[PDB]
Design a protein around this ligand. Sequence first.
Ligand code: HEM
Length: 154
Amino acid sequence: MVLSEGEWQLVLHVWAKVEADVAGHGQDILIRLFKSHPETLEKFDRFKHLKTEAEMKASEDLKKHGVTVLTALGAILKKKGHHEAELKPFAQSHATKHKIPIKYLEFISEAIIHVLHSRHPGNFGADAQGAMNKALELFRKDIAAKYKELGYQG
Ligand code: HEM
């Protein structure tokens, strides 16, 4: 798929707001993921023990990882589709080391959209949400293809 330039502008306009607080957004997104789809927490040996939202919110480690996650995602989105190099090491670790199926990448996509909708309603109307969904769909399609090349196809 190909996004148009106007679709990329909508994506990068709300992302610029996200970047004003990368740690806060990273926390909100991982907590939303783990609350909505508890099975995903099981993939993280470092966080598997956390029992409640309060414990998750209190975790310095979780917040640090949320920064790592959004920083990587931001690098990919800023490439506006030209992200082949960025995708390779992500794909290899998530396919071979962490063993993360495509369905769980759909779940985190849903988490990202929920948090942006809650925090940025004025910059995340219907058109902006459709553009972010398309950007994430593009991401997931390219990762599924790389998964297959790598021998996992998740
Ligand atoms: C937007 C999607 C995601 C991005 C950008 C992302 C990015 C990253 C990055 C940069 C790392 C550290 C380097 C590495 O090991 O590759 C990482 C580690 C990891 N990721 Fe992801 N991730 C994403 C989605 C997921 C999902 C959905 C899961 C599981 C449900 C997951 C599970 C893990 C695990 C288990 C680790 C290792 C944590 C540790 O023990 O340090 N990732 N991810």
